[PDB]
Amino acid sequence: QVQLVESGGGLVQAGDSLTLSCAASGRTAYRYGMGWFRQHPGKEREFVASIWWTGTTTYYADSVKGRFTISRDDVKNMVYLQMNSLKPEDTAVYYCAAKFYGGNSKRPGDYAYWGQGTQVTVSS
Amino acid sequence: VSLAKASLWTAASTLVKIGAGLLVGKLLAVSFGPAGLGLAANFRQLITVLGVLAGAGIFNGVTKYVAQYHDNPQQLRRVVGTSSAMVLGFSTLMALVFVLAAAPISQGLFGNTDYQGLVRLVALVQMGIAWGNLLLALMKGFRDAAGNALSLIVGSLIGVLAYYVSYRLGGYEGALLGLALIPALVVIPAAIMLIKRGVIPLSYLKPSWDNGLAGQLSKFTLMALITSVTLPVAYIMMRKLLAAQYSWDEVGIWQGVSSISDAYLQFITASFSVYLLPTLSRLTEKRDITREVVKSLKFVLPAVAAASFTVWLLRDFAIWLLLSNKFTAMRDLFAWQLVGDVLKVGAYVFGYLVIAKASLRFYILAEVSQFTLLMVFAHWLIPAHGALGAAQAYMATYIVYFSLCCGVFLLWRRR
Amino acid sequence: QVQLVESGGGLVQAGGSLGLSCAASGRTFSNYVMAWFRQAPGKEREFVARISESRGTTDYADSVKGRFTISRDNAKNTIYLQMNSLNPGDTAVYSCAATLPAWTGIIGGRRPGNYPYWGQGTQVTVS
């Protein structure tokens, strides 16, 4: 059992950067693989980036790799999604999800716990 | 001599050898950083291989036949004489190959040919590794745990000082030469201890050739060739699969907890060649053989279980000093790995009985069974659990392998 | 980690002059020990010059001393090699190398294996 809250996100121009933070609150949260998901109105949540529960390997979506970078701090139990070169297409509500001994799946159904979600809007 | 007395003496030499390796290892990482560590990975592996290859891999046979023919002085002289000629002859061929192929060897170890002079220097250093390991194999044949421990301890002290003087003079290449001198300089305290304890006359080391004995010692050369090919290949294809569905850093935490076991298990397994191998080699009947095996299992099983539970209780502390604290999730693989260590140690009892009987039939069957069991379990657990599965497949391998060793032993005992 | 690019190569008659430059990438360039190496066509690497990370202490090979001069510019992360009295025996591919003081030791400053970061090398031909 882990609680996930999201930080950051808001109105930002097109081309600059904007990072996020997912604070993991739970007992032995290092055993949970973390993943980032975003959603558009009408469509379902799509995969963005995840990390293995050991924190050794990372995964990225096809339209995400090279631009976004996901990191995790085990000491403070917080996940990050450093976004670079933002396009208006990246405008979505971003969620961080956790799974016990997971973090290698791109499907939202393979993640047990979810956050409330933060809003990211890219204009210009 | 006994299993308890030999284990305490070997534990002192293991404690010093481990502590000396951590001091040289940390000094290596601090002096040259990650660039010098990755550039020296292949060279360091060759030094470990030379600990067995430079003497043609007859050391287990030397201990077996010295213990078998310790009573007859004329036969014992032929054993040491043939072993001395086999070690001197093969190491000389190794020196010639290392000199002529100094450029290709340096290319295969470092990627360039700037280390030719070091390889040629290693051609002489490996002779000290071969002769030093032979003298230690002679003490093991007489179950001289104290003489073998005193040689390794004193050798560890001069090896640390030699590495210090070498790296301060030669820089990075001096440190590489110093890493090679650490196992080679054991020949100096071992030679002194062989004559101070008076168990073997120095004239017995005169090279002679008994044709029937050289062929018998060649059986252990094939054994060392099989054990250095069968299982290490399984781990190569294991880490290949582990690094195909995950990253190489996931392999790093798998090999990281394995290095944990490789160190602390020596407090139990290193005494097998000092006592169990020479003792089982002298026993002839199945009743006496079963007595030793059961007595050894009643000792190493609770001892390795108390040590494994102690390692699990200090897994957070052991991750700190022994390895770089990079992934805190490295603590979750200890529970599965230490269980497999307990049963692999128990399986080593039956394995060393195969050495004492020079049985090539049971040796190949043991290596093939461990190979098939590892590949079957890794093909099922690695792609799903990652490095945890690599440690889970290793545990399940020796759960079934130890049960297969016990079952095969029961049919062999009752014939 | 450390990238090195040589420049200034060319063809120069016997007894002429030529100057090489080696640009290093990355900070803490002043803490690195830099050196020049050459490789004649069909032969192994040969030490030429080396500049120390402190005192500006230099070291030159026997067949080079009195003719070549190595210098260091920490503000530009650049190593220079002023080659005077160029003989036909100096025709080789000159490459620069970077290393740390612990890699060189006391007497191991002329050995190419003590340098992990190497440059590609520029061609210098005499006569």
Residue numbers in the entry:
A (entry chain C): 1 to 124
B (entry chain A): 1 to 415
C (entry chain B): 1 to 127
Text from the published report:
ECA biogenesis depends on the Wzx/Wzy-dependent strategy whereby the newly synthesized lipid-linked repeat units, lipid III, are transferred across the inner membrane by the lipid III flippase WzxE. The WzxE flippase is an essential part of this pathway and belongs to a larger family of Wzx proteins, which are representatives of multidrug and toxic compound extrusion (MATE) exporters. Wzx proteins translocate a range of lipid-linked O-antigen, capsular polysaccharide and exopolysaccharide repeat units across the bacterial inner membrane. The Wzx translocation mechanism remains unclear but Wzx proteins are ATP-independent.
Nanobodies recognizing a different binding site to Nb10 were sought to obtain a different conformation of WzxE. Crystals were only obtained with a combination of Nb10 and Nb7. The WzxE-Nb10-Nb7 complex was made by adding a 1.2-fold molar excess of Nb7 to the pre-formed WzxE-Nb10 for 1 h at 4°C. Und-PP-GlcNAc (2 mM) was added to the protein complex. The WzxE N-terminal lobe with the nanobody Nb10 superpose well with the original WzxE-Nb10 structures, suggesting a similar binding of Nb10 to WzxE in the presence of Nb7. Extra density can be obtained corresponding to the Nb7 (chain C), linked to the C-lobe on the periplasmic side. The Nb7 binding is similar between the two structures. The three CDRs of Nb7 (loops 2–3, 4–5 and 8–9) interact with the loops 7–8, 9–10 and 11–12 of WzxE. Despite the addition of Nb7, the structures superpose well with the original structure (RMSD 1.16–1.22 Å over 532–531 residues), with a slight approximately 3° shift of the C-terminal helical bundle of WzxE relative to the original structure starting from residue 221, suggesting that both structures are in the outward-facing conformation. Comparing the structures of different WzxE conformations, the cytoplasmic pair R143–R282 are separated by approximately 12 Å (Cα to Cα) in the outward configurations but 19 Å in the inward structure. The periplasmic R44–R239 pair is separated by approximately 19 Å (Cα to Cα) in the outward configurations and 12 Å in the inward conformation.
